[PDB]
Design a binder for this molecule. Structure first.
Ligand SMILES: *[C@@H]1O[C@H](CO)[C@@H](O[C@@H]2O[C@H](CO)[C@@H](O)[C@H](O)[C@H]2NC(C)=O)[C@H](O)[C@H]1NC(C)=O
Ligand SMILES: *[C@@H]1O[C@H](CO)[C@@H](O)[C@H](O)[C@H]1NC(C)=O
Ligand SMILES: *[C@@H]1O[C@H](CO)[C@@H](O)[C@H](O)[C@H]1NC(C)=O
Ligand SMILES: *[C@@H]1O[C@H](CO)[C@@H](O)[C@H](O)[C@H]1NC(C)=O
Lengths: 106, 230, 271, 228
């Protein structure tokens, strides 16, 4: 029986807990808080704006996410950044999708 | 008198929002009596050309045309022929070009390949190519940038699309970007922006630099604070 | 005929672009299903070397991967039981063909697991009198793989229903892939034609949108249909039972679960 | 009378390992008493000819006339002249064959780029590109081998050479070999052979492997604190 305390989707923290049960006796059960953080290793300060360089710092405040920028992309919401595309002398300002198969129109 | 007609690519369909159809005619002498009236699949001509080109290095003349057709009509798939009536032609000639029904819509698999380590070791220059594969139809348009502003067209070259040997239904294309080695040192964000019909938002982007595409080292700083929580 | 509990304890959607052995010499136009593309069966030299030290590790490894593939298939096709069961049947026959070495995939696993099984049976069954070749090993032990992978299926959601293989492995891999493609195409065609008859044959923007979607789907599936049809035409003279039948009528008649009729398949593809 | 005598390409020279000169007649009615021959310097005349077809849908006489002659003869400027003696023209149709001496000779720079990480993450295929840049004659031949054994020609596709934008004299070309993703994970070594005139050994081989672009250094630093 694993209970999920909090879960920040775009940070991918997944703070969970479970009470392991030993033989019946005066209480010696080990309470544990189990987290599973997926570091990107390739994302930027903005995951949407390509101009920002690679981010080395990886900040994970547990209390801040239990209750802004983050590292992991989401599969539900869209990340759209404005991008310039030029054909000839003039230019047209167009949208783009940073990641594929995430929130394509249906 | 030989006429060459270039079909309008989807980049002109989307960016310009007006499909201009032209058919440059080489090996034609300067007479300046050109009236190109584009015709539909029926016998009714729709529009005439707006501007033409006269100057040529080889003292020749090109009878380029122009017409404005609604995008839905162009996507429908009727036959568009530029009916040239120039006095230089001994006899009228018809060139038949239209949107070919029978081409699939496969989502392109856009990937960015970092330059090889040997090319960086040569210290002369680096080439950045974009792996755009598995797209249908064959038409494609890709543009490179650097930190946001567009690069010159003379800096990047686009190769002609070819059918994929593994899957005949899809096509692949390549486009390299020649950059200096000192540009790769303390590398700026080089982007591969390509437009195609099968994309969800019609434009996708891939970004590479020194520390992302085949990095030598993974410099990461991982801090956790307040492990007790609340 | 659900398996016993103790053995149970012991044990995109892009058809094109996959790798096929000698695509131009033979098998011209065959399409690998996404389920086969995402098959949970990867055999490497390290795994074979680690599983050849002790007797029984390689076969149990194969059963474990079959169980994992069954669990993945059941978690994917959770909505419909028939589609999940047919996916299980197709994956079982696929892994059987890979074991027998008849797989047309260009992956090293398909061309190397037969050699691994030959070596394992040779180094361990010198005097055991059990068959040492892959074909007879699959023939005698086809039930064990079935029971193990049914155990793997049952662990996903505790499903009481059980099904037998029912003469699926001896069908060639092309014919099974063709049947799977036909089932998917016929189901999607029934859905699309029902929607089109509902919205356009009793507003204009909805009719135009569904017409564009239908034209795109038809343009993809017509190229797929032509590729599979020419492949079938190159590979139908070997078997006399399927030599005299067109692909569409073969899908309509000899395939019970395809649910393909004249209007569903032939009237829209063969015209 | 279209006697289009296109010289064989360098890729054709190192493909069949034989130099076959071409002198083919196009758009001409098929006749007889056609004594084709090759005349070179010092009056040498050695020839073997085959592939004669009387009937053609386009009513064009084949007259293929392919003869095997050593590469050093081409390297010596022997000016191979075709001498098709057709009936309509009593004089032989002289069509010389020689290398266009005077062109720039720049050796290509072969770079075997590794496959993209996202494509391998998709676990579908593994396309390894062979970027060949910097050759002036624009006569390049690309062939792939695995473990020293050449692959089938249909697994790899090579694009036609096109001029480089920065260097007008130099040309560049690319080719991709598509294999399975777990085939790439197996550890097989793929060799890209690039054949060109300007190379000192006329060929150049580069080897790609799993360990060609791996991160040489990992700088993970696990820092955990119980204070804000
Ligand atoms: C990097 O992150 C900053 C965070 O503030 C972003 O700046 C703004 O982000 C919001 C979020 O959608 C946009 O609506 C604004 O238009 C952004 N500002 C500007 C000036 O574009 C942005 O993602 C990045 N910063 C910049 C300067 O681009
Ligand atoms: C921590 O260990 C327990 C076993 O006591 C396990 O159930 C749990 O999944 C582990 N946590 C994580 C994040 O894997
Ligand atoms: C690597 O990371 C450390 C700690 O974040 C930093 O001090 C150092 O400057 C970084 N070096 C490079 C080359 O990015
Ligand atoms: C690795 O990280 C440390 C700090 O965590 C930094 O001092 C060092 O420079 C980094 N290594 C390199 C090669 O930059």
């Amino acid at each position: 029986e694993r209970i999920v305390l909090v879960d920040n989707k775009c940070k991918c923290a997944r703070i969970t807990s479970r009470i392991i049960r030993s033989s019946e006796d005066p209480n010696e059960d080990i309470v544990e808080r189990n987290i599973r953080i997926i570091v990107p290793l390739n994302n930027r300060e903005n995951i949407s704006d390509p101009t920002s360089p690679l981010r080395t710092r990886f900040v994970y405040h547990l209390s801040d996410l239990c209750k802004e920028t983050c590292y992991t992309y989401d599969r539900n919401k869209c990340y759209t950044a404005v991008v310039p595309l030029v054909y000839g002398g003039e230019t047209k300002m167009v949208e783009t999708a940073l990641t594929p198969d995430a929130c394509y129109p249906d | 008198i030989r006429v060459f007609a270039i079909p309008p690519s989807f980049a002109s369909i989307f960016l310009t929002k007006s499909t201009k159809l032209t058919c440059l005619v080489t090996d034609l002498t300067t007479y300046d009596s050109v009236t190109i009236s584009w015709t539909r699949q029926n016998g009714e001509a729709v529009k005439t050309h707006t501007n033409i080109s006269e100057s040529h290095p080889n003292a020749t003349f090109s009878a380029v045309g122009e017409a404005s057709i609604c995008e839905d009509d162009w996507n429908s798939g009727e036959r568009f022929t530029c009916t040239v009536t120039h006095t230089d032609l001994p006899s009228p000639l018809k060139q038949t070009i239209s949107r070919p029904k029978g081409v699939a819509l496969h989502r392109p698999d856009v990937y960015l390949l970092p330059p090889a380590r040997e090319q960086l070791n040569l210290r002369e220059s680096a080439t950045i190519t974009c792996l755009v594969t598995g797209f249908s139809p064959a038409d494609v348009f890709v543009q490179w940038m650097q930190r946001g502003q567009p690069l010159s067209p003379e800096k990047y070259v686009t190769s002609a699309p070819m059918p994929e040997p593994q899957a005949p239904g899809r096509y692949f294309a390549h486009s390299i970007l020649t950059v200096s080695e000192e540009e790769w040192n303390t590398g700026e964000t080089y982007t591969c922006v390509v437009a195609h019909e099968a994309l969800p938002n019609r434009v996708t982007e891939r970004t590479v630099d020194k520390s992302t595409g085949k990095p030598t080292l993974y410099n990461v700083s991982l801090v956790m604070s307040d492990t007790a929580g609340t | 005929k659900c398996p016993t509990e103790e053995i149970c304890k012991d044990f995109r959607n892009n058809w094109l672009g996959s790798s096929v052995k000698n695509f131009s010499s033979d098998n011209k136009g065959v399409l690998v299903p996404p389920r086969r593309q995402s098959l949970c069966l990867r055999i490497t030299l390290q795994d074979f070397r680690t599983k050849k030290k002790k007797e029984g590790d390689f076969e149990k490894f194969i059963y474990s991967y079959a169980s994992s593939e069954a669990r993945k298939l059941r978690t994917i096709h959770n909505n419909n039981l028939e589609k999940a069961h047919q996916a299980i049947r197709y994956s079982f026959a696929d892994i059987g063909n890979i074991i027998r070495g008849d797989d047309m995939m260009d992956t090293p696993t398909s061309k190397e697991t037969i050699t691994y099984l030959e070596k394992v049976l040779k180094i361990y069954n010198e005097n055991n009198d059990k068959p040492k070749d892959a074909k007879k090993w699959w023939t005698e032990n086809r039930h064990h793989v079935w029971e193990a992978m049914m155990c793997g299926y049952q662990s996903a959601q505790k499903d009481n229903q059980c099904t037998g293989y029912g003469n699926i492995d001896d069908i060639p891999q092309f014919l099974r892939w063709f049947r799977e493609w036909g089932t998917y195409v016929c189901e999607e065609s029934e859905k699309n034609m029902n929607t089109l008859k509902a919205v356009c044959f009793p507003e204009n923007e909805m009719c135009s949108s569904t017409l564009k979607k239908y034209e795109e789907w038809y343009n993809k599936r017509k190229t797929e249909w032509t590729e599979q049809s020419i492949k079938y035409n190159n590979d139908k003279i070997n078997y006399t039972d399927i030599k005299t039948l067109s692909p569409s009528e073969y899908l309509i008649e000899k395939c019970p679960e395809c649910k393909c009729t004249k209007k569903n398949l032939q009237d829209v593809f063969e015209l």
